[PDB]
Amino acid sequence: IKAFEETLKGFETWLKVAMQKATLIDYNSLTGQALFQSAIYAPALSFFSSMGAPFGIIETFTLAPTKCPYLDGLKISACLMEQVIQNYRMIVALIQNKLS
């Protein structure tokens, strides 16, 4: 369970940076979309997989840009970042059901 605790700590360490920097990512630009993939979506996938593995939870988080209907690419990034945090909440709820 120590490995799972370390995963939570890594996730929260990553989250603190991602939550502030995501608001500056223009998702409609070439560099911004790429940076969102490289530095937000990819690490999130890895953390979520590491969280789910000790508990048999096999889910694949996918971004849903259709739920972010904004012309402003900064608002898209913030909205997609919120989907990341929401997925965390969903996995935590699944883990708590397994534990209880």
- Footprint of another protein (CB under 8 A): 3, 6-7, 9-10, 13-14, 17, 21, 24, 29-31, 34-35, 37-39, 42-43, 46-47, 50
CA distances for 12 relative to 7, 18, 28, 59, angstroms: 9, 10, 27, 20
Least CB distance from residue 61 to another protein, whole Å? 13
What 3-state class would DSSP assign to 100?
coil
CB of 67 to another protein, least distance (A): 23
CB of 17 to another protein, least distance (A): 5
Q: How far apart (Å, rounded) are the C-alpha atoms in residues 78 and 24?
A: 9
